[PDB]
């Protein structure tokens, strides 16, 4: 199916506690495969998935030099950002970067992304055209003017249509037994009385990959959106994800409720009921 590669950088200043820490993590779909941390004893790009371990010494060396240069650039950006917002040198601030490419089943580029956030708020983003920027405020307009003057978007587009697509295609081939495998959810419904007249029905989905899933409860075939407690999809720690959806039902009406599960790992969607 469709695949993505994304890099996620976090630079956090810490006045009085040294220079800003730079951390980067790289993903293919929901699978993390690399990390880089400026606070590590000997900062270097490290493998975090089995299929990337085969990359030679030149891979780890080149990438380590890229992150080290980026950490320095982010520290310069944090200083500039503090000035654009007339902020004191005393407070901590965060600069996040998120970029990458989406490709279809045939490896062709579907969409590129290259964007940033300052203190958790969108700051600037490369538009879908990969040629122009959208600035959130008058401070990001300064970054936009600088990047327009430097024709910065052209280098971003070249990576997104080039290296990004070519390396993602390589990683998908090298990690095909996992990256091209969808593990379906293992499901069950639990029943817990709350009182003499109500019980919770909880619909479980376990051991699935990728994370994308749809879990819903219906009462007489009608979606129970407002009355369902739906937890965020969570990692199990073994590459898979979990999720549950619960509803409070009147005692004796359990058979009117159906849990519906949609996941790419499933031949067809599941319809589950409480089986006493």
């Amino acid at each position: 199916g469709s695949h993505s590669m994304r890099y996620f950088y976090t630079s956090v200043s810490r006045p009085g506690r040294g220079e800003p820490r730079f951390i980067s993590v790289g993903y293919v779909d929901d699978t993390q495969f690399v990390r880089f941390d400026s606070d590590a004893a000997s900062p270097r790009e490290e493998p975090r998935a089995p299929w990337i371990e085969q990359e030679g010494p030149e891979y780890w060396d080149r990438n380590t030099q890229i992150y080290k240069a980026q950490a320095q650039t982010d520290r310069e950006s944090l200083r500039n950002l503090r000035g654009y917002y007339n902020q004191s040198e005393a407070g901590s601030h965060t600069l996040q970067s998120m970029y990458g490419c989406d490709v279809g089943p045939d490896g062709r580029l579907l969409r590129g992304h290259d964007q940033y956030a300052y203190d958790g708020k969108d700051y600037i983003a490369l538009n879908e055209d990969l040629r122009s920027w959208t600035a959130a405020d008058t401070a990001a307009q300064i970054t936009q003017r600088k990047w327009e003057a430097a024709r910065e978007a052209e280098q971003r587009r070249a990576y997104l249509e080039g290296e990004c697509v070519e390396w993602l295609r390589r990683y998908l081939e090298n990690g095909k037994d996992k990256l091209e495998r969808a593990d379906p959810p293992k499901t069950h419904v639990t029943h817990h009385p709350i009182s003499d007249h109500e019980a919770t029905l909880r619909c479980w989905a376990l051991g699935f990959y990728p994370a994308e899933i749809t879990l819903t409860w219906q009462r007489d075939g009608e979606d129970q959106t407002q009355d369902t407690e739906l937890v965020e999809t969570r990692p199990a720690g073994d590459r898979t994800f979990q999720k549950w959806a619960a509803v409070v039902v009147p005692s004796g009406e359990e058979q009117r409720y159906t849990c519906h599960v949609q996941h790419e790992g499933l031949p067809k969607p599941l319809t589950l009921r409480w089986e006493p």
């Binding site: 996620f8 941390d37 965060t94 203190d119 958790g120 708020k121 909880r202 376990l206 965020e232 199990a236």
Partner: protein, 99 residues
């Protein structure tokens, strides 16, 4: 400005007394990234808990998984204790096998 963490405490596999498993605490949706997470066994801090590499979602909020190998029993109680700038007191979430 700031976003408080969502916290979920749960096991890697459905819990079975006497069978080795992993106790997880997933913290997500928070900003800024600095956070402190402890896993507790019968109210005491478990030593050498590991965690995932700092990452974040499309809405820029951070998430981390803290985890430890454990063998559940009928008597032992587990919990997760989280501290964050948005919290005036540590927030404790008890492990409930049904959630």
């Amino acid at each position: 400005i700031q976003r408080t963490p969502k916290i979920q405490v749960y096991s890697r596999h459905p819990a079975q007394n006497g069978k080795s498993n992993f106790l997880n605490c997933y913290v997500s949706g928070f900003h800024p990234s600095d956070i402190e997470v402890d896993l507790l066994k019968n109210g005491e801090r478990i030593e050498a808990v590991e965690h995932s590499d700092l990452s974040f979602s499309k809405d820029w909020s951070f998430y981390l998984l803290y985890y430890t190998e454990f063998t559940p029993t009928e008597k032992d109680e587990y919990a997760c204790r989280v501290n964050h700038v948005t919290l005036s007191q540590p927030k404790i979430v008890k492990w409930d096998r049904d959630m």
